[PDB]
Ligand binder design. Structure first.
Ligand SMILES: CN[C@@H]1[C@@H](O)[C@@H](O[C@@H]2[C@@H](O)[C@H](O[C@H]3O[C@H]([C@@H](C)O)[C@@H](O)[C@H](O)[C@H]3N)[C@@H](N)C[C@H]2N)OC[C@]1(C)O
Lengths: 194, 189, 130, 106, 171, 199
RNA sequence: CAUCGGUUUGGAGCGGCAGGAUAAUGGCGGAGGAAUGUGGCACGGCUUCUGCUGUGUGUUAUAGCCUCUGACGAUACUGCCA
RNA sequence: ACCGAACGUGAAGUUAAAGUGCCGGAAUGCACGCUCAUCAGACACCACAAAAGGUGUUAGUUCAUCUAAAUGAACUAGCCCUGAAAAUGGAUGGCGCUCA
RNA sequence: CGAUGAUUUUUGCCCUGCACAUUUUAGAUGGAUACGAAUAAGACUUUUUAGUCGCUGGACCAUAGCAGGCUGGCAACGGUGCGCUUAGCGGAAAGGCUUUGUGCGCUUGCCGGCGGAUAGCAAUGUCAACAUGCGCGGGGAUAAAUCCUUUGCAUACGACUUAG
């Protein structure tokens, strides 16, 4: 028999499953659509949630009852020290979706981002990226060939960047590394900016 | 019943040429050039001479044969549009509120703008199709003139204007306001 | 001028020469309906047949009256030498060459291979010389 | 030369069967290049070999054979029926067999 | 080839009242002689009050076409039974024999009217000798001067499953 | 009719179900098949009708848990795959081994862009349908029901066609030169003697 | 592998004989006829009569067709062959 | 429980009813038509459909008007369309099929 | 499904030239032989007029030699295998398509000389790619993860975020 009385569903069926997130760092599912005619720029930035506070403002909404009047509003502080660019990734269109072609890294990586590649940093020999660094030292010609690859074939260019977590009060020493998409300009301009 | 053969004759006047190849018709005349794709119909063509063309359906049923006079009329409209041109005229009809009509160029694109239709604050903008020219008549009040080489584009674009001005939630027998086609003809009568 | 590309179909019509069973020639004497024609020829039997069972050829017997009897067909056919017209076409030559190739013995196929070898030697020489 | 073949290529298609019941004692065989019963009748009585490889050497060889013979034609498309000394195992549905040219009548 | 035309001649068995009973003939379109005699008795039992047991078949003979390689137009008069009633109709066919036209008629009534063989009586089959006698435009259109027509869109039947060249439908 | 190592079918202009039945019997009998350009396949019937049919397919889903239901694949090669799998005893080991002999692709990816492609006349739309009948292109239908890569495939196919046309121009020039060379050596002793053999 | 005996499925099988309207046709010979009327001829709108073309007339002409029929000769179909 | 056929253990041959695009042994076989459906249709028992409509298309019947280039009326019955609304997602057995 | 970092001072690991040997195989046995598009259309020629072609791949390429041996000559300056080397192109899954020069062969384009037997009148009468292992040669590189303690951005327990 039918429900005796009607009522809306409890909860949304669009946020299923209600499971634990796969990673603590939240990933950007989709980036803003690229506009070639704009200047080359980053589309995202990583920070650390510090807390909340209260502010006072004058409202500017004509027709509102609070127009030209003070309002009190909650607000959130995000601790955002500058990020460090350490690499670049090129993506090619395929009939199966975006596929990463190659990854190119900077010559020097700070200890806080290199800690990201370790589960037991204190017991390791710290070998991460030590042979890669020699790909620059000779004449960097291999690095430039990889970047030329990205210019020739990629349609989407994202930069690799990490937070400077040691400028925050956090006791965590591992930095957070993320891909941030470069929008604006040609692919060649994107690679040069990276 | 599959009539063994049906034929129609295209009359091409002294100042036009008709090039047909793989059911693509290209009609050049003094006023320009028009082209129509007929790949969706199974027909064949023969050049009788420079003034006539035979259009033929072999072993066709009732509907296929019905699609032969249609082809003749479409190509004949191409001819008469590239010779005489096509002009439709629209009269602005209203009881109380005048209908403000303007031809504008937003983003390099010609638009017909209709203002104050039945006193509404909404502004209606209808895109002007390529190859079609609109014009406010300076010899008849409250009249828009729609002209071009292609009868299809001209008539569809006049229809777009007519359809954008439909009265809602009122007795349309009483509220006759609109922009209506009042004359269909050629530029060169 | 106008220049409309017309079709270059072969027509079902009296005098049209057809192949029968990929082997024998005939000519359409009369049309029964959309699907069927009466055919006759010097080396067949006069018969009504379905157009789907025969193959139209580009050759036409000229000025064959509708309904011609076997004697008339034979006389017109001999006068026009339809067989010579057919045997000169590439279609007939390809059929004849297929028939010839299917008659080879093992030893004849061996000879074909060696002759092709000599042919190929000369052809490559002329190819570089080009 | 570089081709040494003296047999005609074939495939093991199926057993004789109705919709639900199979008969392993008769195999259906497709002979390459054969499209009609008339062409297939050339091969009636020809010997068939299914040649396969086995883990264990016998007489120093890992190659083993099941011998049969073409018995009659099957259907209208040139398939044939075959009888093997031992029924071809059903895992060989789709495998290749070798139609000999002997006993020859040419 | 499905059918043959027969004459079937029969009479009542002789009695004392009627020593020489009248011979009757029917033209029958049948697959074989057994069906031909069956049809003869069927029609004789309808038309007259006679039975098979009190009569006899006198002769059964194939009637061959007079001119089997002359193109003709036939008119056929028919009585057939529909799902709903009983109707008369007249149709025209082009053929070189009467049996060919009758076979085409049976196919045509099966196709357009769902009339099975058991539902049809053949009233009369006549070779139309003057072009003015041809009444139906679906056969009349093949009786015009210098009739010629192409056969557009030819489909070639392939022996192989896979073709290495692109299809063509020219002809 | 010959046994090939791999048969590569150009899917352009083939009717879905007829090609599917032919391919199913081919792979069941031990022949490896690759079908390319599945977005160029055809289905008889107008587009709107086949779209309605696909939406009736989408309507079917396991009520108590949609994740268990039928999985409605949208890409054209998967539409052909669904047609083929329906004609295979895919729940047996032999059916699985037959399906492993099959590959289906949008476009013509490597290595098949440099290999010969064939057609199947018993399934060709231009040869099967009556000339006036309406039909659907599977690529349009897929895009209407959620396939995301119509434009990527179109761009890549244009690039492949440019490269293939340049290939063909070179092959045609070489063939013309070879024909001249063989014409220079006609009426030779070997040429005449081969002509006596039908060659 | 060969030959035999039993059962059985085939071949583009080959050949002899019989029947029928002692096939009907066709081919050949004779008489009669007409039209979806060939040649000829006349009237034309278009082709420098460069299949021009259409319409009329009438009956083999610079094509043919249809009906009836005379004497020969086959074939199809059906059946038989110890 | 219908159709076919009734059963010792086997070899070979041939069938019944039912079938021969794939699932599935056997033809994308030969042939004449009809049908296009924004709820087509698809095999007895059997897994239903009516009264009633259609200027969709096809073939027929009977009248009538026309050079003093064909058309007008009434009707018949085929396939197709409307009439045709139920509850988990789903069943011509499935795939799929449109000169099938 | 992809990109990328680092991959054990153990005699463990990577790459590479061989040689011998073992397992495996949904099933080698000359060659998977590359335009695109239309189909009431294509192509070629002269020209946009006409002619011709297809009407199946029963095609094309390859194909002779102890499963292909050993030796001689003629004509050609070609064809072809392997091997170093050169230049370009290919990112859809490129992993392939070409190309320069150069050393060792082969050539059935033509003509010779020598060998095959007895596996007995057939018996797959054994000739493949892929993988792995072991022996030599050549080079090359020299880590981490988990437990444990810790944290509380986490938590029923596992798991997770941290630090050592
Ligand atoms: C020839 N006799 C027909 C018989 O075949 C059948 O007719 C169906 C008819 O009912 C169908 O039509 C009906 O049924 C369909 C659907 C439910 O099947 C509905 O969509 C449709 O609206 C309805 N009118 C029609 N589409 C086909 C005819 N053969 O039903 C009985 C009948 C009308 O007498």
């Amino acid at each position: 028999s039918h429900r005796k009385y009607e009522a809306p569903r409890h909860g949304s069926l669009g946020f299923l499953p209600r499971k634990r997130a796969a990673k603590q760092r939240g990933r950007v599912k989709s980036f803003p659509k690229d506009v070639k005619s704009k200047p080359v720029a980053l589309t995202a930035f990583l920070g650390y949630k510090a807390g909340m506070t209260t502010i006072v403002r004058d409202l500017d909404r004509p027709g509102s009852k609070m127009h030209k009047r003070e309002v009190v509003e909650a607000a959130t502080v995000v601790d955002t020290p500058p990020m460090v660019v350490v690499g670049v990734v090129g993506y090619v269109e395929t009939p199966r979706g975006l596929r990463s072609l190659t990854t190119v890294w900077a010559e020097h990586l700070s200890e806080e981002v290199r800690r990201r590649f370790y589960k037991n940093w204190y017991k390791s020999k710290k070998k991460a990226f030590t042979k890669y660094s020699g790909k620059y030292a000779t004449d960097a010609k291999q690095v430039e060939t990889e970047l030329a690859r990205i210019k020739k074939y990629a349609s989407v260019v994202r930069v690799l960047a990490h937070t400077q977590i040691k400028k925050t009060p956090l006791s965590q020493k591992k930095a957070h590394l993320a891909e941030i998409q470069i929008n604006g300009g040609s692919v060649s301009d994107k690679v040069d900016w990276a | 019943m599959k009539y063994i053969q049906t034929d129609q004759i295209l009359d091409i006047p002294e100042g036009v040429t008709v090039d047909i190849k793989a059911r693509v018709v290209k009609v050049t005349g003094p006023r320009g050039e028009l082209t129509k794709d007929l790949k969706h119909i199974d027909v064949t063509f023969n050049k009788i001479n420079n003034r006539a063309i035979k259009i033929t359906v072999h072993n066709g049923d009732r509907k296929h044969v019905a699609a032969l006079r249609t082809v003749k009329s479409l190509i004949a409209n191409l001819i008469t549009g590239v010779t005489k041109g096509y002009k439709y005229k629209m009269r602005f009809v209203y009881a109380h509120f005048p209908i403000n009509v303007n031809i504008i160029k937003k983003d390099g694109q010609d638009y017909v703008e209709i203002r104050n239709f039945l006193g509404e604050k909404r502004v209606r903008e209808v895109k002007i199709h390529e190859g079609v020219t609109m014009e406010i008549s300076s010899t008849q009040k409250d009249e828009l003139i729609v002209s071009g080489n292609s009868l299809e584009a001209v008539s569809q674009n006049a229809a777009d204007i007519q359809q954008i001005c439909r009265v809602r939630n009122k007795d349309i027998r009483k509220f006759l306001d609109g922009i209506y086609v009042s004359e269909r003809g050629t530029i060169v009568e | 001028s106008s220049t409309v590309k017309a079709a270059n179909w072969r027509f079902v019509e009296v005098g049209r020469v057809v192949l029968v069973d990929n082997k024998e020639l005939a000519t359409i004497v009369e049309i029964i309906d959309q699907k069927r024609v009466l055919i006759d020829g010097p080396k067949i039997q006069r018969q009504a047949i379905a157009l789907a069972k025969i193959v139209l050829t580009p050759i036409v017997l000229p000025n064959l009256p509708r309904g011609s009897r076997t004697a008339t067909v034979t006389k017109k056919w001999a006068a026009a030498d339809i067989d010579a017209k057919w045997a000169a076409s590439g279609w007939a030559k390809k059929l004849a060459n297929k028939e010839r190739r299917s008659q080879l013995s093992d030893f004849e196929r061996f000879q074909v291979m060696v002759l092709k070898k000599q042919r190929r030697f000369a052809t490559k020489k002329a190819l570089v010389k080009a | 030369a570089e081709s040494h073949r003296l047999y005609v290529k074939g495939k093991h298609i199926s057993y004789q069967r109705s919709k639900s019941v199979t008969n392993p004692n008769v195999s259906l065989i497709q002979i390459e290049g054969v499209a009609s019963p008339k062409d297939a009748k050339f091969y009636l009585g020809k010997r068939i070999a299914y040649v396969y490889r086995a883990p264990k050497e016998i007489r120093g060889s890992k190659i083993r054979v099941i011998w049969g013979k073409v018995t009659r034609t099957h259907g209208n498309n040139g398939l044939v029926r075959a009888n093997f000394k031992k029924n071809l195992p059903p895992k060989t549905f789709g495998a290749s067999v070798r139609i000999m040219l002997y006993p020859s009548n040419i | 080839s499905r059918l043959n035309e027969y004459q079937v001649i029969g009479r009542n068995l002789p009695t004392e009242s009627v020593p020489e009973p009248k011979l009757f003939r029917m033209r029958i379109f049948a697959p074989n002689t057994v069906v031909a005699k069956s049809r003869y008795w069927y029609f004789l039992q309808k038309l007259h009050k006679v039975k098979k047991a009190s009569g006899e078949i006198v002769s059964v003979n194939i009637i061959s076409e007079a001119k089997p390689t002359k193109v003709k137009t036939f008119g056929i008069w028919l009585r057939y039974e529909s799902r709903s009633g009983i109707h008369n109709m007249y149709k025209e066919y082009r053929d070189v024999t009467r049996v060919g036209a009758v076979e085409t008629m049976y196919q045509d009534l099966a196709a357009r009217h769902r009339a099975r063989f058991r539902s049809i009586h053949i009233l009369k089959v006549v070779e139309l000798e003057k072009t003015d006698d041809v009444k139906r435009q679906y056969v009349k259109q093949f009786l015009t001067k210098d009739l010629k027509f192409p056969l557009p869109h030819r489909v070639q039947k392939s022996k192989k499953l896979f073709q290495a060249t692109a299809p063509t439908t020219f002809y | 009719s010959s046994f090939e190592k791999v048969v590569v079918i150009d899917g352009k202009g083939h009717l879905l179900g007829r090609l599917a039945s032919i391919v199913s019997k081919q792979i069941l009998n031990g022949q490896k098949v690759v079908v390319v350009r599945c977005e160029e396949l055809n289905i008889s019937g107008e587009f709107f009708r086949n779209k309605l049919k696909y939406h009736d397919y989408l309507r079917k889903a396991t009520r108590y848990n949609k994740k268990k239901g039928p999985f409605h694949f949208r890409a054209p090669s998967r539409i052909l795959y669904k047609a083929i799998r329906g004609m295979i005893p895919h729940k047996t080991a032999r059916g699985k081994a037959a399906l492993e002999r099959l590959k289906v692709f949008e476009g013509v990816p490597p290595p098949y862009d440099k290999k010969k492609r064939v057609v199947v006349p018993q399934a060709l739309r231009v040869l099967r349908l009556k000339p006036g009948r309406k039909y659907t292109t599977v690529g349009k239908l897929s895009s209407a029901v959620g396939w995301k890569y119509e434009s990527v495939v179109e761009k890549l196919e244009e690039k492949r066609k440019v490269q293939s046309a340049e290939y063909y121009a070179k092959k045609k020039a070489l063939t013309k030169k070879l024909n001249a060379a063989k014409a220079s050596t006609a009426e030779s002793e070997a040429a005449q003697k081969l002509a006596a053999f039908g060659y």
